[PDB]
Design a protein around this ligand. Structure first.
Ligand SMILES: *[C@@H]1O[C@H](CO[C@@H]2O[C@@H](C)[C@@H](O)[C@@H](O)[C@@H]2O)[C@@H](O[C@@H]2O[C@H](CO)[C@@H](O[C@@H]3O[C@H](CO[C@H]4O[C@H](CO)[C@@H](O)[C@H](O)[C@@H]4O[C@@H]4O[C@H](CO)[C@@H](O[C@@H]5O[C@H](CO)[C@H](O)[C@H](O)[C@H]5O)[C@H](O)[C@H]4NC(C)=O)[C@@H](O)[C@H](O[C@H]4O[C@H](CO)[C@@H](O)[C@H](O)[C@@H]4O)[C@@H]3O)[C@H](O)[C@H]2NC(C)=O)[C@H](O)[C@H]1NC(C)=O
Ligand SMILES: *[C@@H]1O[C@H](CO[C@@H]2O[C@@H](C)[C@@H](O)[C@@H](O)[C@@H]2O)[C@@H](O[C@@H]2O[C@H](CO)[C@@H](O[C@@H]3O[C@H](CO[C@H]4O[C@H](CO)[C@@H](O)[C@H](O)[C@@H]4O[C@@H]4O[C@H](CO)[C@@H](O[C@@H]5O[C@H](CO)[C@H](O)[C@H](O)[C@H]5O)[C@H](O)[C@H]4NC(C)=O)[C@@H](O)[C@H](O[C@H]4O[C@H](CO)[C@@H](O)[C@H](O)[C@@H]4O)[C@@H]3O)[C@H](O)[C@H]2NC(C)=O)[C@H](O)[C@H]1NC(C)=O
Ligand SMILES: [Zn+2]
Ligand SMILES: [Zn+2]
Ligand SMILES: [Zn+2]
Ligand SMILES: [Zn+2]
Ligand SMILES: [Zn+2]
Ligand SMILES: [Zn+2]
Lengths: 206, 206
């Protein structure tokens, strides 16, 4: 009987319109003692609005049971701590797990767009680069757009720990050299808790 | 009794002056049966030049024993396969492990240097960017230099799998804006099997 507690999707925590939730998973629940109760606490205060899912038997003759607690946008960003306690007759004592947003003084990213290198304008496609640096904590989302439509031919590196303790990354959008030279506007779009409204946008053009 | 087989350091495989080696580690060797023999094979042909280290007792009442086989620069790059076989009276059968250089058609990186973004020239330090794209396999080394001396105030992202099946990364070197504007030459230095002599260099200046 082991317990895992998973945080919300990072994007769900950064957009007020979404519903972040924390997920408490119990595995290796017995057939002989399959009863399980969850208790949830927010900063140690018990709360009662979680949603537990019906048990599901696994192929290795164990049960798996899940409970989902919605968290408030502001509670998560303000560092509230979420505890999941799992009780079962087979355990000597209940199992407790706690989770919160990544801790530490927040730092606002600086977003910089970089045009193709001169040497790359030989090729048929060119790389449009978005540098995002100086942010803390590392939870971040990055996407690209042009003319009110997503540009999805991109890849983004994981966050990399920089020498001052902040994080940076780069996102690379690949476009036809014709579109670059035709003058279209491309935008690097960044979501991070420390931005105003957790959002900023930076453009790139010839 | 478990066996782990480790490849050479990537940089040791890319510089003919260095000595790449493969390392075969055996852990959880008994006290009651601590005798261990290694056999090594290169493409299935037994070889006899390995160097086995004396057993070392661990704090959990087990032994750990290591054998080191040197590999030739060309053998490793040409995809030869190295097998480590570990025999012990406590096993029903010997344990065999095989390792080789990462497999797949090699692809030569393109190296591009990118100067600071216009918006960053406000700050006291600026970011010099080296994009390395299109390479396969992902083993790679990246460093920076200026005026025949290393510039070590840099960070490099891990390789990221690109949508064509090749890899890319970015390396970010941070320098005083004064040095950038004084006109110094900075060089992104890249080692990868698919380059000529597994080496190339690209420069960056105002
Ligand atoms: C008997 O079987 C059960 C059932 O599982 C088997 O499952 C697979 C393999 C099948 O093929 C069959 O063989 C079986 O049915 C076994 O249960 C497993 O026990 C493992 C421990 O022994 C446990 O390992 C731990 O996994 C953690 C990762 O879990 C992730 O990722 C795995 C895949 O990598 C995935 O299977 C899980 O479902 C889970 O996926 C995430 O789930 C969360 C919660 O739902 C998601 O979060 C939500 O996402 C939504 C959107 O999707 C939304 O954003 C919500 O807001 C958000 O909350 C999240 O998105 C999911 N991610 C993905 C990518 O899907 C590890 O973290 C953990 O690691 C710790 O382990 C070590 C410490 O001991 C350390 O290395 C380290 O510290 C790690 O932190 C464990 O590895 C398995 O997860 C668990 N399987 C399941 C399905 O629960 C059981 O073990 C077996 N018993 C025996 C005796 O064999
Ligand atoms: C009893 O104790 C022993 C001894 O260890 C204890 O060790 C530590 C923890 C102490 O604090 C004490 O508690 C004990 O003394 C236990 O032995 C351990 O068993 C583990 C398995 O149960 C095994 O795990 C496997 O580790 C692999 C990684 O090994 C790396 O990294 C670890 C740290 O992460 C490091 O400790 C190892 O030494 C090894 O380090 C690399 O070694 C290679 C070879 O030397 C280096 O390569 C060479 O490098 C040089 C330059 O340095 C040169 O370039 C050469 O050319 C090159 O060949 C390499 O540089 C080293 N790297 C670093 C960063 O140092 C994992 O890969 C492996 O993973 C597989 O595991 C799973 C599959 O089952 C999967 O997740 C996955 O597929 C993984 O691939 C395992 O996790 C430990 O390594 C092993 N410890 C040692 C020291 O050998 C024993 O278990 C314990 N028994 C019991 C019952 O408790
Ligand atoms: Zn309740
Ligand atoms: Zn706490
Ligand atoms: Zn908010
Ligand atoms: Zn021999
Ligand atoms: Zn083979
Ligand atoms: Zn060579």
């Amino acid at each position: 009987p082991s317990v895992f507690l998973f945080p919300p999707k990072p994007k769900d925590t950064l957009m007020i319109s979404r519903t972040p939730e924390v997920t408490c998973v119990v595995v290796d629940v017995s057939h002989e003692d399959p009863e399980v109760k969850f208790n949830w606490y927010v900063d140690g205060v018990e709360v009662h609005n979680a949603k537990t899912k019906p048990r599901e038997e696994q192929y290795n003759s164990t049960y798996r049971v899940v409970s989902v607690l919605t968290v408030l946008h502001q509670d998560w960003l303000n560092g509230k701590e979420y505890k999941c306690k799992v009780s079962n007759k087979a355990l000597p004592a209940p199992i407790e797990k706690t989770i919160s947003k990544a801790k530490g003084q927040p730092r606002e990213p600086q977003v910089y767009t970089l045009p193709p290198s001169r040497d790359e304008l030989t090729k048929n496609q060119v790389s449009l680069t978005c540098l995002v640096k100086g942010f803390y904590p590392s939870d971040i989302a990055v996407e690209w757009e042009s003319n009110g439509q997503p540009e999805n031919n991109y890849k983004t590196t994981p966050p990399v720990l920089d020498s001052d303790g902040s994080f940076f990354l780069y996102s690379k959008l690949t476009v036809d050299k014709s579109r670059w030279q035709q003058g279209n506007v491309f935008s690097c779009s960044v979501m991070h808790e420390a931005l105003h409204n957790h959002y900023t946008q930076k453009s790139l053009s010839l």
